[PDB]
């Protein structure tokens, strides 16, 4: 149904899932195609071998990687909302959209084709009670990791920005620029909101 998490504990909770669910086939959805260019660099760097799908990469790569995910057994991909339209795989158990969606109505059609949940503190199936203590302590490791690579500083820069630009180009009363930037920055690990 949904999980309630703050903008600090947002990617913290996501990273906590992907390590334990390495055996399974789960789907992570983002709003921007410039957000997945960050996550599919971090997780491949910290050795959770995820797959990368976005608009900014070439079509033959977009085909030959997504094909490999269909024929896999243990795999995991990161793809956007708009790029994953029409090509859905039954080989799935968790459909977990991370960002707020494009259409609040069309997402219902996206599910009933897998288990669905959202992430909302600023904003059928059951909610999920969440332990505060057992989140992974990889934040200061990431804070050291961001300010010492440049490439991951730039991809985080255009991860944070593109996410927040898509957050402002929404239509709902819930998703209308309420979330403070002192929390949203630590999702992409910053001392200042870029």
């Amino acid at each position: 149904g949904y999980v309630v998490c703050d903008s600090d504990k947002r990617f913290l909770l996501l990273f906590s899932f992907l390590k334990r669910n390495q055996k399974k086939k789960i789907i992570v959805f983002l709003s921007s195609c410039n957000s997945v260019k960050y996550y599919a660099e971090l997780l491949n760097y910290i050795d959770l071998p995820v797959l990368e799908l976005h608009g900014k990469q070439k079509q033959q790569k977009r085909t030959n990687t997504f094909f490999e995910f269909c024929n896999a057994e243990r795999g995991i991909l990161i793809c956007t909302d708009v790029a994953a339209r029409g090509l859905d795989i039954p080989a799935v158990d968790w459909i977990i959209q991370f960002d707020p969606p494009d259409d609040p109505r069309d997402y219902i059609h996206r599910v009933g084709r897998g288990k669905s949940l959202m992430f909302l503190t600023p904003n059928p199936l059951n909610e999920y009670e969440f332990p505060e203590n057992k989140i992974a302590n990889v934040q200061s490791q990431l804070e050291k990791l961001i300010k010492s690579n440049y490439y991951l500083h730039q991809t985080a820069k255009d991860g944070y920005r593109s996410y927040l630009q898509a957050y402002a180009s929404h239509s709902l009363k819930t998703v209308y620029q309420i979330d403070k930037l002192d929390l949203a920055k630590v999702a992409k690990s910053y001392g200042f909101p870029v």
Partner: protein, 65 residues
């Protein structure tokens, strides 16, 4: 004549930095000015016009006795 300065603008703290200037590579990479100086002294040692710090001890171990 002497009103207290009512801080009508500093009351509210800023979240983001003022400018969105992209950080340069050189702020993360080892400095190239340092590399320039080092590779200048390197030349000076090959030419023999700067005597190395290791031999400078040997020039005073033999002299001023």
């Amino acid at each position: 004549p002497y009103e207290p300065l009512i801080d009508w603008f500093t009351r509210h703290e800023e979240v983001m930095p003022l400018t969105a200037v992209p950080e340069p590579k050189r702020r993360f990479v080892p400095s190239k000015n340092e590399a320039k100086r080092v590779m200048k002294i390197v030349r000076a040692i090959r030419e023999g016009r700067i005597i190395p710090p290791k031999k400078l001890k040997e020039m005073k171990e033999k002299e001023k006795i």
